Amino acid sequence: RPRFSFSIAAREGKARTGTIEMKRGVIRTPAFMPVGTAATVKALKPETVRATGADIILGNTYHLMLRPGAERIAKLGGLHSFMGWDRPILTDSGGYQVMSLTKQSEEGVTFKSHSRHMLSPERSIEIQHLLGSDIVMAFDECTPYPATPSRAASSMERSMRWAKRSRDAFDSRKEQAENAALFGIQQGSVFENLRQQSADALAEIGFDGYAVGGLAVGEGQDEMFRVLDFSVPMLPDDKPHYLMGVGKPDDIVGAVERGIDMFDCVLPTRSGRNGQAFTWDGPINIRNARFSEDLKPLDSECHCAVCQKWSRAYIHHLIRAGEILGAMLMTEHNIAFYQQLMQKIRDSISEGRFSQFAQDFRARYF
Amino acid sequence: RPRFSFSIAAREGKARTGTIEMKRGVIRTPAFMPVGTAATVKALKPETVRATGADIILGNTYHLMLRPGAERIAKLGGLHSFMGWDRPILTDSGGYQVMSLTKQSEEGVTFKSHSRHMLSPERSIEIQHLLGSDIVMAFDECTPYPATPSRAASSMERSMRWAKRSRDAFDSRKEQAENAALFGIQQGSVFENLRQQSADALAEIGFDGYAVGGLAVGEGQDEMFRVLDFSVPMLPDDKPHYLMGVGKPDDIVGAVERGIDMFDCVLPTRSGRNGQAFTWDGPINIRNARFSEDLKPLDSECHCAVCQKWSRAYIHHLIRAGEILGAMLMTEHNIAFYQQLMQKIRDSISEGRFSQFAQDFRARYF
Numbered sequence: 009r010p011r012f013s014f015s016i017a018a019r020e021g022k023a024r025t026g027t028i029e030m031k032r033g034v035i036r037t038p039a040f041m042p043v044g045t046a047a048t049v050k051a052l053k054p055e056t057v058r059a060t061g062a063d064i065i066l067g068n069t070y071h072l073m074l075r076p077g078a079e080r081i082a083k084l085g086g087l088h089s090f091m092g093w094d095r096p097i098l099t100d101s102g103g104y105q106v107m108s109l110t111k112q113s114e115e116g117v118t119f120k121s122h123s124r125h126m127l128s129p130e131r132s133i134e135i136q137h138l139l140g141s142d143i144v145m146a147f148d149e150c151t152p153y154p155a156t157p158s159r160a161a162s163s164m165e166r167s168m169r170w171a172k173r174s175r176d177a178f179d180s181r182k183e184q185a186e187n188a189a190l191f192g193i194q195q196g197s198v199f200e201n202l203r204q205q206s207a208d209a210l211a212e213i214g215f216d217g218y219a220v221g222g223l224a225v226g227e228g229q230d231e232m233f234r235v236l237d238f239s240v241p242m243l244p245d246d247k248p249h250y251l252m253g254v255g256k257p258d259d260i261v262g263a264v265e266r267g268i269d270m271f272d273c274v275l276p277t278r279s280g281r282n283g284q285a286f287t288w289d290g291p292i293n294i295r296n297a298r299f300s301e302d303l304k305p306l307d308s309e310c311h312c313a314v315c316q317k318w319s320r321a322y323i324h325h326l327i328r329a330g331e332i333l334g335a336m337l338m339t340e341h342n343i344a345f346y347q348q349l350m351q352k353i354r355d356s357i358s359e360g361r362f363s364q365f366a367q368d369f370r371a372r373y374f
Numbered sequence: 375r376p377r378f379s380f381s382i383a384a385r386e387g388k389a390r391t392g393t394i395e396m397k398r399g400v401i402r403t404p405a406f407m408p409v410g411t412a413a414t415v416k417a418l419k420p421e422t423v424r425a426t427g428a429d430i431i432l433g434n435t436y437h438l439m440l441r442p443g444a445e446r447i448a449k450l451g452g453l454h455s456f457m458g459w460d461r462p463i464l465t466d467s468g469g470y471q472v473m474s475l476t477k478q479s480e481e482g483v484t485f486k487s488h489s490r491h492m493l494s495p496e497r498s499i500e501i502q503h504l505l506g507s508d509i510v511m512a513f514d515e516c517t518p519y520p521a522t523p524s525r526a527a528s529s530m531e532r533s534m535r536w537a538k539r540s541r542d543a544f545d546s547r548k549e550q551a552e553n554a555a556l557f558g559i560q561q562g563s564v565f566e567n568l569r570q571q572s573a574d575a576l577a578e579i580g581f582d583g584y585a586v587g588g589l590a591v592g593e594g595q596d597e598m599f600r601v602l603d604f605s606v607p608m609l610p611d612d613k614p615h616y617l618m619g620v621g622k623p624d625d626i627v628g629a630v631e632r633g634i635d636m637f638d639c640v641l642p643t644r645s646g647r648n649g650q651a652f653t654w655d656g657p658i659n660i661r662n663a664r665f666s667e668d669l670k671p672l673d674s675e676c677h678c679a680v681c682q683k684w685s686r687a688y689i690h691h692l693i694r695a696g697e698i699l700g701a702m703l704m705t706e707h708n709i710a711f712y713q714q715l716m717q718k719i720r721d722s723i724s725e726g727r728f729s730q731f732a733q734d735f736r737a738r739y740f
């Protein structure tokens with residue numbers, strides 16, 4: 009088990025399928041990472057998360073640095089033993105969440121805990137180290153949407169300076185540099201020239217993987233794909249491409265077609281508790297009266313435990329009754345559905361029939 | 375597998391240990407029945423409930439007749455397939471919940487859904503049949519606490535008339551009378567003569583088991599035990615004795631010492647989500663700051679999955695963060711703890727050392 013090794017086993021167009029080997033395990037790509045906000049993938053035990061097929065989960069730094077605190081989790085042995093997940097864990101830098109859920113300067117960002125806090129590239133990298141993150145994300149400044157070329161450039165340029173600092177901060181910490189990986193984050197809003205600048209600077213600094221940031225800011229899928237079309241090719245081909253905050257089945261398939269290898273999004277979990285269930289025939293709102301006496305499983309083909317044991321009628325009842333089990337069952341199904349999606353994606357690419365799979369997927373889902 | 379067969383395998387004082395054989399399974403007594411309010415044991419999958427050691431669960435008729443409706447559940451195949459629990463299920467008559475969570479008459483009770491509804495002995499028995507209940511409880515009128523001798527007598531006498539009606543309603547339904555069992559409920563508040571009257575009337579009508587009702591109404595454990603001391607002996611010795619709504623470790627041990635064979639209470643589940651965890655050293659509130667960095671499991675001896683994988687510090691974090699997993703883990707532990715309690719009880723009685731076990735239990739728990 010090497011610190012980090014990305015191998016591409018097959019391609020079709022811009023799409024790629026392969027593996028990322030790390031000390032804590034192998035990550036099959038394209039990969040979908042279930043999101044674990046506060047040291048938990050909402051409503052699911054780690055074993056359940058793994059059982060659905062996930063090889064890696066995403067840990068939210070923002071919430072953890074606040075509660076229960078990075079230093080504390082390190083004192084308890086790290087995020088891995090703390091939450092009972094022994095496989096790889098990717099941690100975001102926290103800057104994003106801060107700018108969403110404040111005084112900003114070239115040194116970093118200061119904010120009030122919804123207490124006062126300072127978060128810089130150095131502190132971000134240290135927090136992720138304290139948590140014991142396997143894939144560390146560089147600390148960046150997200151660019152609001154819409155953004156003017158000038159503003160986008162300033163932010164992108166600041167992010168690149170911050171990327172260099174993240175890099176050095178990471179390399180300066182022996183244990184971290186030797187057991188974990190560092191991903192740089194491309195910015196530049198929807199402007200091609202900025203994206204190119206960011207890509208080259210990122211490549212110039214050198215990272216283990218490259219993320220495409222600033223694309224989950226309210227733009228439509230059409231604009232996102234347009235941006236991906238010219239952005240992903242700018243990134244080093246032999247390293248993973250990670251589309252941050254992007255999920256939603258059809259979004260994922262389109263991004264893979266454009267070269268993305270990694271995904272994360274709260275939709276599976278959040279929508280689940282909200283009553284939305286993903287199926288190959290598109291999403292459905294289980295709370296709708298039409299499911300009150302529907303004995304069929306959430307999805308007719310899904311092989312997840314939920315679809316094997318319970319009906320839509322029962323889950324319909326639980327969600328409308330505000331029952332915790334409803335949240336558990338919906339979330340397990342959705343995450344299982346997402347992993348199943350990724351598996352079909354990896355298989356179709358390995359078999360040189362991903363294009364057909366994508367077409368067939370869209371035809372039925374919509 | 376007979377319809378109903380209670381066998382006592384061992385005794386020590388008033389305590390008894392044995393089994394109740396029913397079509398859907400064997401129930402080891404003394405037994406604790408996890409409570410499933412709205413067709414679910416809050417925060418737990420049926421397999422998990424079973425894994426903790428439960429042989430039977432209690433289904434709340436009240437909530438089910440309202441949502442999703444008895445007729446509907448019968449249409450979907452019954453409570454068993456609806457919730458994924460194929461073992462025995464005991465259903466309360468619903469009258470209690472109505473008088474708690476309204477126009478009362480000799481024919482029954484009318485109430486407003488917190489819609490208008492009528493619930494009589496006949497309707498109660500039919501609802502439980504529609505749900506597919508294995509152990510049907512007679513429809514009774516609970517006696518408020520405190521209650522005067524006159525009022526207690528009127529209510530007890532009405533309950534006895536209602537017990538006869540429940541009996542006939544049950545026997546008049548072929549499929550139900552042949553596959554399920556019927557338990558009568560003793561009333562009479564804290565008055566010995568009324569309890570005796572109720573017991574004889576109940577015995578006169580004849581039931582498969584006898585419950586001691588009206589004892590979870592705010593009286594202290596001292597008064598409850600006093601009542602149990604003279605009440606339980608009045609009930610037929612060769613049939614199960616069920617103390618309704620009574621849980622809380624020390625309450626259970628004391629009631630077994632006084633001849634009770636069956637228990638149910640929401641404390642395990644409700645307290646769990648509230649942050650209270652039961653241990654052999656007494657209950658603890660996991661939210662307390664003293665557990666923020668406690669790496670030990672909820673309880674040092676518990677063999678439940680939660681205590682094998684997660685620390686008090688993690689569960690402390692989840693509960694304070696309002697995380698669903700916290701509710702899941704706390705509830706699994708508590709129910710597992712309750713089942714472990716019952717096992718130690720059954721074993722000590724089988725081994726003629728229940729008295730010592732009770733003494734040792736109290737010494738440490740308190």
Ligand SMILES: Nc1nc2ccccc2c(=O)[nH]1
Binds near residue numbers: 145150223224252254
């Ligand atoms: N740090 C960071 N995190 C993100 C998460 C989702 C979408 C976008 C981003 C982004 O641009 N930067």
Ligand SMILES: Nc1nc2ccccc2c(=O)[nH]1
Binds near residue numbers: 470516559586
């Ligand atoms: N039907 C019924 N249910 C109960 C539940 C808990 C305690 C007491 C009672 C009782 O007396 N009757």
Ligand SMILES: [Zn+2]
Binds near residue numbers: 306
């Ligand atoms: Zn499913």
Ligand SMILES: [Zn+2]
Binds near residue numbers: 673677681707708711
């Ligand atoms: Zn435990």
